[PDB]
Amino acid sequence: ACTKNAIAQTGFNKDKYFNGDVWYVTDYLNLEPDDVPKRYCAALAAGTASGKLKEALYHYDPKTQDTFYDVSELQVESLGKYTANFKKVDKNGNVKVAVTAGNYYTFTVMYADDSSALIHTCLHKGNKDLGDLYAVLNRNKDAAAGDKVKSAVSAATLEFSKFISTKENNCAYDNDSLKSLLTK
Ligand code: HEM
Ligand SMILES: [N+]
Numbered sequence: 001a002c003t004k005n006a007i008a009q010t011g012f013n014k015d016k017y018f019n020g021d022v023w024y025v026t027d028y029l030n031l032e033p034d035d036v037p038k039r040y041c042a043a044l045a046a047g048t049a050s051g052k053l054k055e056a057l058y059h060y061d062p063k064t065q066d067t068f069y070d071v072s073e074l075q076v077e078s079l080g081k082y083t084a085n086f087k088k089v090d091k092n093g094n095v096k097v098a099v100t101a102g103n104y105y106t107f108t109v110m111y112a113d114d115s116s117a118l119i120h121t122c123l124h125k126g127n128k129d130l131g132d133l134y135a136v137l138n139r140n141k142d143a144a145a146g147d148k149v150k151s152a153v154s155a156a157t158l159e160f161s162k163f164i165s166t167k168e169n170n171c172a173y174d175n176d177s178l179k180s181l182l183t184k
Contacts, residue, residue, distance in 0.1 A: 004120060007110065008110065024140070025135045036133070038164060039061070040164075044056060054182045058178055070089065071181050083104055086103055117136070118135070121135070134163070136163065141173065
């Protein structure tokens with residue numbers, strides 16, 4: 001179960017965050033033990049497509065090779081806080097699992113600048129018991145977390161030392177698919 005009401009960044013700049021470009025997860029913190037593997041790869045694109053606020057996701061388990069993409073229209077709860085009903089798609093946007101009630105994630109941007117961000121997400125998917133997940137993002141897939149975002153982790157009363165890095169997993173991403181999925 002999720003337990004955190006994450007606070008969105010004061011003065012969050014939505015148009016800059018949702019500019020159509022890609023964000024890579026560089027580090028993550030799952031609050032519930034064993035909710036996720038200790039080696040993982042994830043990235044997203046975020047943008048407005050034909051007037052609609054969208055995110056495209058990519059997940060890859062570098063050990064098992066499990067791979068999946070998603071696309072969602074985000075609904076607004078407040079500035080920087082969204083609810084996203086997701087559909088599983090192949091890389092070309094063909095639907096594998098349709099949107100359905102009870103399949104949604106929340107998404108809160110706690111900190112962002114042009115190059116880095118800190119987000120919280122809570123996944124709801126059928127009768128799974130999933131918990132809070134924080135992620136440090138960067139525009140550059142190889143970037144070590146800088147002082148702005150690490151200070152934001154501290155300001156959220158979290159310990160960056162607990163976050164797990166994705167950088168040692170040989171992660172390679174299809175940025176073209178993520179961008180094009182925004183339209184799907
Ligand atoms: C931007 C950050 C993230 C968002 C918005 C997000 C969202 C989601 C969504 C929507 C699903 C379900 C997809 C589907 O069934 O179609 C999912 C599944 C999953 N995510 Fe993430 N995720 C993010 C990052 C991560 C990270 C960093 C990990 C670390 C391992 C992770 C681990 C998983 C796992 C293991 C599943 C499979 C759950 C299951 O069905 O048992 N995610 N995520
Ligand atoms: N997740």
